């Protein structure tokens, strides 16, 4: 019983992996999918797309989609790098620097400034 917001977050915060699903997991997901769908030689983004579309139209159950997304979250542990981070106790916003592989102080502000920066520059690298 995972919410669709959590399914979408799993689909959005992880890198698009290929050949990341052991055949065990691909047949287990195929058993939990509609229309003969076969997840194999399919990317992480493609599988998440398939499952979310199959879930919006009530083709698969919430428990099934949630189990599939749990298997996907277990398989794909390659998270995207967030472009910004915010420390709410210090009211500071940091920006990831590829040239330092670290988060550097960027500006002052809280969640509102963070969301404005995300809308203007993107959430991920």
- In angstroms, this model's resolution equals 2.0
8 A C-beta contact, residue 4 and residue 53: no
Angle between helices 4-13 and 62-75 (to 10 degrees): 20
8 A C-beta contact, residue 105 and residue 96: no
- Distance between CA 26 and CA 3 in Å, rounded? 22
Angle between helices 4-13 and 44-56 (to 10 degrees): 160
């Amino acid at each position: 019983a995972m919410k669709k917001i959590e399914m979408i977050e799993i689909s959005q915060n992880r890198q698009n992996l290929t050949a990341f699903l052991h055949i065990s997991e691909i047949k287990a997901i195929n058993a939990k999918l509609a229309d003969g769908v076969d997840v194999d030689k399919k990317s992480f983004d493609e599988i998440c797309s398939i499952v979310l579309e199959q879930y919006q139209a009530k083709q698969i159950s919430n428990k099934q989609a949630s189990e599939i997304f749990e298997t996907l979250a277990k398989a794909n542990k390659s998270f995207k790098i967030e472009k910004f981070r915010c420390s709410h106790g210090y009211n500071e916003i940091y920006k990831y620097s590829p040239d330092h592989e670290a988060y550097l102080f960027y500006c002052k502000g809280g969640q509102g400034q963070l969301n404005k920066l995300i809308a203007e520059n993107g959430r991920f690298m």
